[PDB]
Design a protein around this ligand. Structure first.
Ligand SMILES: CN(C)c1ccc(O)c2c1C[C@H]1C[C@H]3[C@H](N(C)C)C(O)=C(C(N)=O)C(=O)[C@@]3(O)C(O)=C1C2=O
Ligand SMILES: CN(C)c1ccc(O)c2c1C[C@H]1C[C@H]3[C@H](N(C)C)C(O)=C(C(N)=O)C(=O)[C@@]3(O)C(O)=C1C2=O
Ligand SMILES: [Cl-]
Ligand SMILES: [Mg+2]
Ligand SMILES: [Mg+2]
Lengths: 179, 200
């Protein structure tokens, strides 16, 4: 009866209310109106659930995972970074939930497509990987800072700061794509 | 009664043992061998303590806060970023505790420095903030990865398997350095650009 899709859907809703710190097995089980073992069947620990949410957030919101036809690689990385940022900001503690996670089997497929697309535009395999990792780290760090300050007590400044750092990061890749 | 510096020192000590989540008022009072009211005298809540820890980490480990005499602004930003990274890496949940903290004298001094190196006041702010966000992001993911328990072994394709096997002879410093060098190389170009690079 209770499928993995329904659990994730209920968990993302509950996450936005309580946050990742207050999100527990009992709360999610009570929200789904099931006993804890039915939920434990899907996720044996909190980290396993948060990993599934991290994947779900991108699957739902992260629209620009892959390069489009006749898209400049600089435009792709900007749109990819903005799309990734939007996905983390869409849910409470999105950046902190994403932190430490390694790509899933599909994400490795999309990552390889990104790496090969950059390699075709003059990047060396190593500097393509570092560029994509550097962008993801920059976004996670920017979103964490935004979500951290919002949790406590100028968003125009964060938006302007993010866009300038992202454009700078891409402008830098142009020069340092290959030795 | 104990001074604010002694509580902060003891709190930094516990942080590296138990972590942010386990850093309770009981543990800190038991460590200092005092009653809990003694702690509440200095810090009314945990966020106030974590704000003090965030500053204390930089005061302790962050050595390159200001540029040296006749130091190139690009060299400063790299050494400043590496010094800031070192400070956050030296403490459990370092990047996580820093996140959300806002300035002030040293921050304003760094803005005026870049402002004298072909930056515009807004872009000087954005540049400094952007660097800190890249470092906070890099440290958070590394600290999260080390706390939550190989990338070459998971890779389903031969291309990624072989590539990650080579990148495991470079180190994590190589990856961070490239992103930092790219970020600063970007500033060098976009600091005096007439195009809008803070929108879209
Ligand atoms: C394969 N590859 C280079 C790695 C290796 C280790 C990693 O820890 C990661 C990657 C890929 C990058 C790609 C980036 C990509 N982007 C540059 C923002 C991205 O759009 C995605 C995505 N799901 O499309 C990521 O997963 C991503 O955020 C990510 O989480 C990564 C990531 O964490
Ligand atoms: C005024 N100014 C530009 C702001 C505004 C909002 C902010 O949220 C911040 C700054 C300064 C920047 C400076 C950077 C600096 N650097 C680029 C790494 C830095 O070295 C320091 C430092 N204490 O030396 C920071 O606090 C800093 O990491 C930081 O946390 C900042 C920060 O969080
Ligand atoms: Cl190389
Ligand atoms: Mg990631
Ligand atoms: Mg800061």
């Amino acid at each position: 009866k209770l499928d993995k899709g329904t659990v994730i859907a209920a968990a993302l809703e509950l996450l936005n209310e309580v946050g990742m710190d207050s999100l527990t097995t009992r709360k999610l089980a009570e929200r789904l109106k099931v006993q804890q073992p039915a939920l434990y069947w899907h996720f044996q620990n909190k980290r396993a659930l948060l990993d599934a949410l991290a994947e779900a957030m991108l699957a739902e919101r992260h629209t620009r995972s892959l390069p489009e036809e006749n898209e400049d690689w600089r435009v792709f990385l900007k749109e990819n970074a903005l799309s990734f940022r939007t996905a983390l900001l869409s849910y409470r503690d999105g950046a902190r939930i994403h932190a430490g996670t390694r790509p899933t089997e599909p994400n490795f497929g999309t990552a390889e497509t990104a790496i090969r697309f950059l390699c075709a535009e003059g990047f060396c395999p190593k500097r393509a990987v570092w560029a994509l990792r550097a962008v993801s780290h920059y976004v996670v760090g920017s979103v964490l800072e935004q979500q951290a300050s919002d949790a406590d007590e100028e968003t125009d400044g964060m938006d302007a700061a993010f866009n300038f750092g992202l454009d700078s990061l891409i402008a830098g890749f142009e020069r340092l794509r290959s030795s």
